[PDB]
Amino acid sequence: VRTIKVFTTVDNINLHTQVVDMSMTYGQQFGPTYLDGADVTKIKPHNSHEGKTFYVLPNDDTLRVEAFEYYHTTDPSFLGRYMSALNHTKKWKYPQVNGLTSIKWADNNCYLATALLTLQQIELKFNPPALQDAYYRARAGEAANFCALILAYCNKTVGELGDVRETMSYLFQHANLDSCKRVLNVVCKTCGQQQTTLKGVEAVMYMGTLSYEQFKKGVQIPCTCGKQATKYLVQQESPFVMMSAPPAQYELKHGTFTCASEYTGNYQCGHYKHITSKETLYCIDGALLTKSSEYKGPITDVFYKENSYTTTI
Amino acid sequence: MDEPLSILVRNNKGRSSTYEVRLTQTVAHLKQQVSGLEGVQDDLFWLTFEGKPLEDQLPLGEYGLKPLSTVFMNLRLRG
Numbered sequence: 001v002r003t004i005k006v007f008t009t010v011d012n013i014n015l016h017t018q019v020v021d022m023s024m025t026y027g028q029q030f031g032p033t034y035l036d037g038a039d040v041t042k043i044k045p046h047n048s049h050e051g052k053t054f055y056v057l058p059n060d061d062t063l064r065v066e067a068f069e070y071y072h073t074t075d076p077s078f079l080g081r082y083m084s085a086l087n088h089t090k091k092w093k094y095p096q097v098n099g100l101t102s103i104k105w106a107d108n109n110c111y112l113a114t115a116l117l118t119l120q121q122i123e124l125k126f127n128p129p130a131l132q133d134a135y136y137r138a139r140a141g142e143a144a145n146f147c148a149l150i151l152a153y154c155n156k157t158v159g160e161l162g163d164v165r166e167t168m169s170y171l172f173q174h175a176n177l178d179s180c181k182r183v184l185n186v187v188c189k190t191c192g193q194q195q196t197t198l199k200g201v202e203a204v205m206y207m208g209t210l211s212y213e214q215f216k217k218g219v220q221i222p223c224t225c226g227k228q229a230t231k232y233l234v235q236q237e238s239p240f241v242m243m244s245a246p247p248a249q250y251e252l253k254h255g256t257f258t259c260a261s262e263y264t265g266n267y268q269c270g271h272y273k274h275i276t277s278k279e280t281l282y283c284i285d286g287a288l289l290t291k292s293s294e295y296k297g298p299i300t301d302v303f304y305k306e307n308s309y310t311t312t313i
Numbered sequence: 314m315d316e317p318l319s320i321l322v323r324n325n326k327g328r329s330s331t332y333e334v335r336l337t338q339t340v341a342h343l344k345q346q347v348s349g350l351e352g353v354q355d356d357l358f359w360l361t362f363e364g365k366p367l368e369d370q371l372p373l374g375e376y377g378l379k380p381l382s383t384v385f386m387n388l389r390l391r392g
């Protein structure tokens with residue numbers, strides 16, 4: 001009976017020697033099994049496979065612990081989802097545009113390219129080692145692993161239409177945002193004043209206006225009495241803020257923001273581009289790059305640099 | 314134990330509505346209720362609680378939802 005030596009893994013760091021019977025499929029021996037993203041569950045070992053590393057699902061305590069320590073998830077299917085994405089993302093191209101890793105268009109991935117470009121421009125430290133490592137490689141220009149992990153964490157598949165805001169929502173859960181703090185005040189001429197403090201993710205995201213300045217000055221929102229109260233920013237402690245709104249024509253002025261998302265289309269179906277403010281305004285559309293001194297277009301999300309802000313109100 | 318509780322879900326325009334739920338039931342069941350009440354297809358939005366997005370397959374209890382918690386209904390873009 002012919003056999004071969006292979007290694008199994010869930011993290012590609014800790015390897016586990018296995019001797020496999022060449023007359024049985026990988027699936028019969030390991031369960032779902034992947035070779036560099038390819039599903040080999042129904043395949044029998046090939047001679048050329050000797051000494052290769054295969055991903056398996058975390059099907060015992062040691063692998064469960066390794067997988068949790070690396071990915072900070074215990075969803076048993078996470079690895080399979082990651083591998084399926086990776087089988088595609090390893091085939092995408094990742095052009096360097098103005099020093100940032102982008103993604104050449106494939107598989108309706110404009111939203112991921114915009115998210116990735118954004119991530120490379122805001123100060124954010126991921127908690128799972130998987131994301132730290134993959135982000136380092138993606139900045140080195142090999143972003144396949146990072147993008148497949150994004151898809152896996154968001155429970156989206158390759159080819160699926162995506163939302164940038166939702167993607168960031170998923171990704172921030174896996175970031176160290178503990179020392180982020182936001183203080184808001186809401187003033188109603190009827191009801192009086194109520195201060196609120198927000199921490200972590202809720203401290204860096206707002207949906208309703210694109211303008212950080214407007215958020216500092218005040219936005220009108222409904223109160224529980226029915227009048228219009230004013231919500232304004234009292235204090236901000238974070239390395240960035242994200243201001244979001246339904247897509248609307250908005251003028252981006254060089255030097256007044258970090259980067260922004262543009263959505264052209266309709267809620268049901270549409271297209272993202274990325275705008276970044278450098279020496280001028282650069283519009284990145286996957287591999288494509290254009291530049292301009294001014295900008296007006298359908299913006300949905302704007303990111304701003306921050307350190308510490310306190311109102312004079 | 315595991316008695317039904319009422320939570321709030323605030324839509325994209327700002328109106329909250331009450332929903333009787335049980336922490337044992339899945340996010341997807343709450344999502345069906347919200348779709349029915351708001352008249353928005355459940356593919357068109359995602360739910361968040363205290364910033365964290367709610368995954369359809371998990372039971373609401375996984376998220377520490379307490380009586381009169383407010384979930385936020387976020388209109389989703391398909392870019």
Ligand SMILES: [Zn+2]
Nearest residue numbers: 188191223225
């Ligand atoms: Zn009021």
